[PDB]
Amino acid sequence: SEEVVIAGMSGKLPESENLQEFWANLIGGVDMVTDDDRRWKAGLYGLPKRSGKLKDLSKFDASFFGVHPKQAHTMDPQLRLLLEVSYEAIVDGGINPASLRGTNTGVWVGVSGSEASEALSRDPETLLGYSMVGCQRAMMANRLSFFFDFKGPSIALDTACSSSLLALQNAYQAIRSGECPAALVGGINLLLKPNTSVQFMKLGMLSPDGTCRSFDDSGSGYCRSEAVVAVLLTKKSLARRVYATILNAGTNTDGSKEQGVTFPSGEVQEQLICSLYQPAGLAPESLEYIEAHGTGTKVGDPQELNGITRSLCAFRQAPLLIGSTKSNMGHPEPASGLAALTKVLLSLEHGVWAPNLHFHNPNPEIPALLDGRLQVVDRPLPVRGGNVGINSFGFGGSNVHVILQPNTRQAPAPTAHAALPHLLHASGRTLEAVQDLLEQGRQHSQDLAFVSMLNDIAATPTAAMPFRGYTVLGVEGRVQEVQQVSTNKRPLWFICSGMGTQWRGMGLSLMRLDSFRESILRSDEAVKPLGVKVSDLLLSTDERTFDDIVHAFVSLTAIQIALIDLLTSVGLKPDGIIGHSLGEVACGYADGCLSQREAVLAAYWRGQCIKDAHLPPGSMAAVGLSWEECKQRCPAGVVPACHNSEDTVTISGPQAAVNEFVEQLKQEGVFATGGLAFHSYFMEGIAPTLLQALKKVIREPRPRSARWLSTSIPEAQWQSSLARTSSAEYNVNNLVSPVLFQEALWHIPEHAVVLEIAPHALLQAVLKRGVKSSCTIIPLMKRDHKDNLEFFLTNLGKVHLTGINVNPNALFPPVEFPAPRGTPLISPHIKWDHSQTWDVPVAEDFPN
Amino acid sequence: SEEVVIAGMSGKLPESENLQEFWANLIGGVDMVTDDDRRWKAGLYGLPKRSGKLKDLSKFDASFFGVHPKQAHTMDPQLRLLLEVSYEAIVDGGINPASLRGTNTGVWVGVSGSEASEALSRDPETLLGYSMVGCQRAMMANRLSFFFDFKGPSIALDTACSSSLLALQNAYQAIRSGECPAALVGGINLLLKPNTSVQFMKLGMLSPDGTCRSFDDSGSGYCRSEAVVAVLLTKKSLARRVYATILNAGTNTDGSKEQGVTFPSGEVQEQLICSLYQPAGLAPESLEYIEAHGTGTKVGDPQELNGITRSLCAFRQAPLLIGSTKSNMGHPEPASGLAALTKVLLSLEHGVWAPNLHFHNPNPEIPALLDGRLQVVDRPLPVRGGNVGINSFGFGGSNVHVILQPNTRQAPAPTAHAALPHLLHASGRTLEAVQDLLEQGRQHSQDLAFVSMLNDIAATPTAAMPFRGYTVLGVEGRVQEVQQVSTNKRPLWFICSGMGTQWRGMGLSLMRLDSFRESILRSDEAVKPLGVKVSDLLLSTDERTFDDIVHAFVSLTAIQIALIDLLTSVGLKPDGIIGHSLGEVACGYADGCLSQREAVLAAYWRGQCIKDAHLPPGSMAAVGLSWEECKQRCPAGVVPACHNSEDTVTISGPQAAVNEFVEQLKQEGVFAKEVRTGGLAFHSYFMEGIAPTLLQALKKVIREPRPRSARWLSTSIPEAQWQSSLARTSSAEYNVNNLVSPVLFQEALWHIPEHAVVLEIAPHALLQAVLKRGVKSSCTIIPLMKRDHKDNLEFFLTNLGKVHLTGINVNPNALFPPVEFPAPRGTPLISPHIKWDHSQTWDVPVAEDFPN
Numbered sequence A: 001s002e003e004v005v006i007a008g009m010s011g012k013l014p015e016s017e018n019l020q021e022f023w024a025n026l027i028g029g030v031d032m033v034t035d036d037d038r039r040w041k042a043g044l045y046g047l048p049k050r051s052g053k054l055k056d057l058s059k060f061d062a063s064f065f066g067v068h069p070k071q072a073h074t075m076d077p078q079l080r081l082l083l084e085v086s087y088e089a090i091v092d093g094g095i096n097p098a099s100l101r102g103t104n105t106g107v108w109v110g111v112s113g114s115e116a117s118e119a120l121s122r123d124p125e126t127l128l129g130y131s132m133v134g135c136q137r138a139m140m141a142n143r144l145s146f147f148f149d150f151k152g153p154s155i156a157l158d159t160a161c162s163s164s165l166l167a168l169q170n171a172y173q174a175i176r177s178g179e180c181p182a183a184l185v186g187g188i189n190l191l192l193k194p195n196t197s198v199q200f201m202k203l204g205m206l207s208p209d210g211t212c213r214s215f216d217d218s219g220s221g222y223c224r225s226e227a228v229v230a231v232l233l234t235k236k237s238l239a240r241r242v243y244a245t246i247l248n249a250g251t252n253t254d255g256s257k258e259q260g261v262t263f264p265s266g267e268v269q270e271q272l273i274c275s276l277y278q279p280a281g282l283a284p285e286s287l288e289y290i291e292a293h294g295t296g297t298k299v300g301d302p303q304e305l306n307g308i309t310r311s312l313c314a315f316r317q318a319p320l321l322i323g324s325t326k327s328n329m330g331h332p333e334p335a336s337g338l339a340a341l342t343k344v345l346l347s348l349e350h351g352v353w354a355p356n357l358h359f360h361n362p363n364p365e366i367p368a369l370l371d372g373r374l375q376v377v378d379r380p381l382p383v384r385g386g387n388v389g390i391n392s393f394g395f396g397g398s399n400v401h402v403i404l405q406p407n408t409r410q411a412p413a414p415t416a417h418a419a420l421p422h423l424l425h426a427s428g429r430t431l432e433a434v435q436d437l438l439e440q441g442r443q444h445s446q447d448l449a450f451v452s453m454l455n456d457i458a459a460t461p462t463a464a465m466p467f468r469g470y471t472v473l474g475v476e477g478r479v480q481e482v483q484q485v486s487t488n489k490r491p492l493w494f495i496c497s498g499m500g501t502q503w504r505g506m507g508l509s510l511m512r513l514d515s516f517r518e519s520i521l522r523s524d525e526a527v528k529p530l531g532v533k534v535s536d537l538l539l540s541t542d543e544r545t546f547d548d549i550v551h552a553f554v555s556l557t558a559i560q561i562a563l564i565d566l567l568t569s570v571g572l573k574p575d576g577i578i579g580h581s582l583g584e585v586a587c588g589y590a591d592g593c594l595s596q597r598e599a600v601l602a603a604y605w606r607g608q609c610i611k612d613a614h615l616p617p618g619s620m621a622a623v624g625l626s627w628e629e630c631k632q633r634c635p636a637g638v639v640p641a642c643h644n645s646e647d648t649v650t651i652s653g654p655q656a657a658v659n660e661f662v663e664q665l666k667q668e669g670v671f672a673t674g675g676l677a678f679h680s681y682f683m684e685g686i687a688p689t690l691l692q693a694l695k696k697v698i699r700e701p702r703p704r705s706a707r708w709l710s711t712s713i714p715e716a717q718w719q720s721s722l723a724r725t726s727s728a729e730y731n732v733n734n735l736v737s738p739v740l741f742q743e744a745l746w747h748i749p750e751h752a753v754v755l756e757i758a759p760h761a762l763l764q765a766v767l768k769r770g771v772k773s774s775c776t777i778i779p780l781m782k783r784d785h786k787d788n789l790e791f792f793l794t795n796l797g798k799v800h801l802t803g804i805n806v807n808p809n810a811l812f813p814p815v816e817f818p819a820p821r822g823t824p825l826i827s828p829h830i831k832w833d834h835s836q837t838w839d840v841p842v843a844e845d846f847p848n
Numbered sequence B: 001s002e003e004v005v006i007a008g009m010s011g012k013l014p015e016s017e018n019l020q021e022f023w024a025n026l027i028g029g030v031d032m033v034t035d036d037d038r039r040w041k042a043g044l045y046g047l048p049k050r051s052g053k054l055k056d057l058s059k060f061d062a063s064f065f066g067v068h069p070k071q072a073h074t075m076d077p078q079l080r081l082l083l084e085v086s087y088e089a090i091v092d093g094g095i096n097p098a099s100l101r102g103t104n105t106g107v108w109v110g111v112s113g114s115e116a117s118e119a120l121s122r123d124p125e126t127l128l129g130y131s132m133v134g135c136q137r138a139m140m141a142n143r144l145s146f147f148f149d150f151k152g153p154s155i156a157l158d159t160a161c162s163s164s165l166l167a168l169q170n171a172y173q174a175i176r177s178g179e180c181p182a183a184l185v186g187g188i189n190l191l192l193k194p195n196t197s198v199q200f201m202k203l204g205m206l207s208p209d210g211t212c213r214s215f216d217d218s219g220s221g222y223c224r225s226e227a228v229v230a231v232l233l234t235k236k237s238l239a240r241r242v243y244a245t246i247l248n249a250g251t252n253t254d255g256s257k258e259q260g261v262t263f264p265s266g267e268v269q270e271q272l273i274c275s276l277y278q279p280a281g282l283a284p285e286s287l288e289y290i291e292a293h294g295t296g297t298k299v300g301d302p303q304e305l306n307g308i309t310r311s312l313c314a315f316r317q318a319p320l321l322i323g324s325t326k327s328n329m330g331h332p333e334p335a336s337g338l339a340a341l342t343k344v345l346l347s348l349e350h351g352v353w354a355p356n357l358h359f360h361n362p363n364p365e366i367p368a369l370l371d372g373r374l375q376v377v378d379r380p381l382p383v384r385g386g387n388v389g390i391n392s393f394g395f396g397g398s399n400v401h402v403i404l405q406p407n408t409r410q411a412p413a414p415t416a417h418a419a420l421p422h423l424l425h426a427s428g429r430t431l432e433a434v435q436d437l438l439e440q441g442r443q444h445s446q447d448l449a450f451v452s453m454l455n456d457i458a459a460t461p462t463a464a465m466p467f468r469g470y471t472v473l474g475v476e477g478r479v480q481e482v483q484q485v486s487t488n489k490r491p492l493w494f495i496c497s498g499m500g501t502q503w504r505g506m507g508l509s510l511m512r513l514d515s516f517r518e519s520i521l522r523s524d525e526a527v528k529p530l531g532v533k534v535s536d537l538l539l540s541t542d543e544r545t546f547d548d549i550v551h552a553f554v555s556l557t558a559i560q561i562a563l564i565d566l567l568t569s570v571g572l573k574p575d576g577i578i579g580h581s582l583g584e585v586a587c588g589y590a591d592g593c594l595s596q597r598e599a600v601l602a603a604y605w606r607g608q609c610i611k612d613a614h615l616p617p618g619s620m621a622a623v624g625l626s627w628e629e630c631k632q633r634c635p636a637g638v639v640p641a642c643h644n645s646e647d648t649v650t651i652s653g654p655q656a657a658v659n660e661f662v663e664q665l666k667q668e669g670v671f672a673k674e675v676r677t678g679g680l681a682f683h684s685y686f687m688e689g690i691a692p693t694l695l696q697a698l699k700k701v702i703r704e705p706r707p708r709s710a711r712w713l714s715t716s717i718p719e720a721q722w723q724s725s726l727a728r729t730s731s732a733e734y735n736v737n738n739l740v741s742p743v744l745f746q747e748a749l750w751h752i753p754e755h756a757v758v759l760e761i762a763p764h765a766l767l768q769a770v771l772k773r774g775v776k777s778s779c780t781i782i783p784l785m786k787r788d789h790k791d792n793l794e795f796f797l798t799n800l801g802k803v804h805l806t807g808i809n810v811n812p813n814a815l816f817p818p819v820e821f822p823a824p825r826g827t828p829l830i831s832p833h834i835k836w837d838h839s840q841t842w843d844v845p846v847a848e849d850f851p852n
């Protein structure tokens, strides 16, 4: 009531294009403060040459954010960057942004400077109205709320250095209280305007060396720095990834102080800390590490650390580890808190505290550094376990402290079926975007949570993310396609194929998959009282198992049902359905006419009734002749049985006549079963005995829907009493009547996606010829493929490639969240279309 | 679940130097939008000539706020003005700011613009570091928190037009939750930089006519305006004044909208409203009036009002009254919400809704205006009763709504309490500041709550408010002084006087005062078993009552105790204490040595033991001779008895010798007059006769001798022996010693420090004369009662006033029965009578300080 977690993060920091580059610099002891001329000539107005600066301000994937180019060029680069970082942070947490649209999710952005607004409003003659909508401080929050459709609070707040952590704290209370299910929290700072650094210099706040020497005797001021950081908070119930749980957080203010408004009151800071620990059941003994503000100033460092000594150290046996991210990258003013937060969370996730720079000699006014009660993290130390504190104190006296509980959940042990292959989808703005996400999958193909999260974020509108891809994890090579999509809503068609598609040990492969095996085990309950188990048949090693015509009819249709069950579980419902032979039983299941039990028995009795009449030897053959031209040339006894295409027709009749009429047909160069002759007169013998058996199984005939196109009954009689329902009468009719397949294939619309639901994809050949050029035709199993699970997965991948959304996670047992600690970061692999590049204000745009 | 009230308010609005001028303009239908050149040449860059502007930005009482002049000149005028308005708002609510120092009181300021910061940071070569501390947006909140010592949150927030009402809403939740006992909420906007108006113009947001034609068909944009407003919220338990109770408030945000980020979503606004009424037990039927955002834009007016129609009108039988303060003064952007709030609260307080301007033809896209379900307040209508809604919606989509319950408490009946005089104090920055507050008191002298509040806020540090004053209400003429104070902490001395101070029906007057009467009735219980009641003695008509030496001793000391009890109840604890004669008994009470019972019996037995010995006729006389010169010239049997001053000494002895030594002393031209003593010779050998009989009686009354403190200076025992066994405690032994030993009074009066305040605690102020001569020139000497004054209550009050005049804080409210708060509705505003020292004028950025 209610637990609040840090779910996702991203950022741009000095010399750090994303949080991965940031971690690299932290743990590697790189100093991200630089002295180049990026923002203004170094030395200008006597300023320090050193400051923390972002690599680039010019990039922004404008069309993704609905920004036309004339506006993009007049947005605060703070905002352009924050839009990307905010998206990065939401998907970092395994969360599809669509899941939060329309919700009362809040946005709080800590921000102290609107230097671009100043620049872009300097000339009345030429300025643009829309510059306000891209630059005014309120918009730093409001444009986020607008893009993401977050209808909770949308506030830009300024408390100077504490602004971003105060934003965290405000968001935290909104979630704890119930106001908000989640919150996007931002911190931003840019160094565009030199006059600002001069004001700070003249106040005595900036060190000339341009260095935050956190805790050192040598410390003589702070280094100004840039940062764009965002973090997603959610209530625990919505989280996938969880970096940490926020145990507590508050703010107070120094109030009145004899020494002046910018003198930090260590006593009041201490007061804030004290109010948040022991009074809330949280012991200072529980802390492992505290991230101090640590700007490295003569006055403020001792105030702060001595305050820590009195509020926390005094109630502890063990030394308290202390650090400050500012030693590494300088001080990004209002973004300081979230910048530091990312250091803490990256440190926790990697198991190692990233060390401070510039700590050579403890400040002698700070007893606890000299007696070892505080221990500066000055080389990488391993994370021993414990809660974490964060200070962020602004120069006007606004103080904030937050207490974190790191997530320590470990990966599950691999089970019997983590050995399986998995499927990974991706969407993206560019080819590289998709390539990178897929590569990350390949590199962490065993991290079930990581893959589960990547799959959740892949289902996106095709307008927004026009590139898709898939790869199959857990198999020999790089099995991968990636391609651009066009935004046609591509309609989905199921084709259930007939006999001929059986084979030796089919579905031995897919029985490994728990989801498939369950649809087989449910088909077992339909045929247990009749002394047969489909599960045994599929798992059988016996060469001859499927020779028996009941073993074949039941196994063929039980596999079609399992394939339909999987396809359903991943979110595919068909726009149209078409059968061939025995496939019309499976179509009935796909249409909601037959239950599972009904359809499996309609295959058993269809097979049992034919086996028991020990009929004469018959034969069929596909032949290269049209429909009307088969009736012409067919010897007596042989009839055209299935209208596959304009060129292919399958004929049916007695073995004698058919084997002869085929050898005489090859001798004129023309294209040319179980010893049975389906869809001929031969089965009118079965008609009455079947009708009776299947009247006992299909008691309550349910209507066929518009989506299912019949192949047992021509278009002409679609309206009839027979065609209304999937009755026992409908089924018998299918057996004797011809299969009018090419008849239905005319109806398939442009750009459709056609799925051949069968244990072997026999009709691939026919469907290409029968269906429009645009349409893509996708098999699901192939006969004697080394591994059909791989095959199935690879072809689901091809469906995702079309623009239809597919979520593979339902194929495998669901992952238990929160994700384990150490689950790889997602934010750094979200890549944008930066073909771009956009205007950025420059020093000469401001007064001198 | 803690009730949150709006306790106090102040502001500067267009053409309106305070909320009274603002109310005058509202109810009078004055248009505060003007077209002069104050900020920039009107018309510049094609801008509207019209905007709402403050009369002045140049004033600020810098030293009061601890701002040195070099910094004052480089502060955002927003902040300078906000500091004054914030102070004004706290004291408006009857609340002394000192009562909130050190507390977790929060500060939230809605603010969208830092145009002064831009100006003051334009030249690197010459700019000041201090400019940041006076101009950066965070400081608009942080400097308030610094000055007032408010240690809760200190946040400057920007949601464009909704910022100040969002600040109200955030503060509201902090108080409701327990985070904060109170909160200062500000809203600020200035029009310094023309380029900003150009940006707004180019976005299509500003009407050319420079007018918010709220709800009119004609409406084509908004008028930009300035405003500095602040409001104090508290939890109910801390409030004195209560304008209204906040029943509910929330914010949401429009989110995603096809039409663009600055298109207002009436549907989402509706959603916000819906979430705050029926789900919280608040019925739309309960509203009387809703203050709409009402910027007067083609698109936004219908979105808003139709949203109101669907969220509220649809659940109402009666028409809903609607208005917008923006018709009156334009739109002050982030300060819009609190500006509108003051309209609502002023309207409520005066009993009349201030009408909109510029409403001629209803916007035809708004059905509810045409069918009468919404009724624009376009002429002044009386307030019939009901809850009030306020909308404030920012152009980036941040929406806020607050629901108010107006305060309707009425003044109690004057009833069976027949009207006493009261005392009214005031502090201020200038003479006028004090004169005005006192005048307001005089004009509302029967509003008990108003007076009680004015008294609470008068107690201030003397460094900060160097002028004080008082008046006595409820009496014949104008009893008033006002004067400047010096910042010496002036120490407070009590002088308990001796005999001679009795008189016929003394304290008949002060028995009206409940607190005094009770200290008499407690002195009655000490002497009921001995067949005497002091209350009867004071109320007695018998001319001779106080001739009897026990009637006098007990009544004199019982009144001294009651005066000490009053002085205590108004907050005065003495820095030093000094007795004379029988006064050393009362000193014991004032020092915490004697209980009330102990001290009243130590007067009874001191008097009864002298009455019993019917000793020889004796006499005393004050004489014009120094201490050592009396031992020289005194005939044997006469001794110098009391050392009153360097000039006056009272001699004591047998009637024979003293009457002769007085006629021989006038024949050498020396001052010499008899003292009326009951024919007795105090502080002579004559009382060694009483010594044993008293010591025994007083050992039965003072069972457990308690130590005298450093504060009490003895007059029965010289300085030299202050360390002794006798002087440790206020024992029976100490008391007997006083009777026989001389009274060493001028001895103690040397010790009284410079600039002290000396109170003669006696039923008549006999020693006034003596104390002036005995004590340093600086020191001020104040009586408390005077013999045969027409009315001693008036006198007492007038002299408490004179104590307040010195810089020592006195709170008269405890003398009278406590006022029940919240104050009644209509209690006069305080904010407009808080006047500052505006002698200095300060820099204000100008249009030329920005780019062109």
Ligand SMILES: CC(C)(COP(=O)(O)OP(=O)(O)OC[C@H]1O[C@@H](n2cnc3c(N)ncnc32)[C@H](O)[C@@H]1OP(=O)(O)O)[C@@H](O)C(=O)NCCC(=O)NCCS
Pocket: B498, B499, B500, B502, B503, B581, B620, B622, B642, B644, B648, B650, B675, B676, B677, B682, B766, B769, B770
């Ligand atoms: C300082 C002092 C000289 C001033 O005396 P004062 O100004 O004449 O004061 P008084 O109380 O006498 O009052 C003034 C007038 O009212 C008269 N009066 C009215 N009511 C009176 C009353 N109840 N008792 C005595 N006199 C009274 C006086 O006779 C006097 O008359 P005058 O104006 O014609 O001279 C003198 O009060 C003094 O020294 N008192 C201290 C005596 C002392 O030390 N001990 C006494 C007992 S231990």
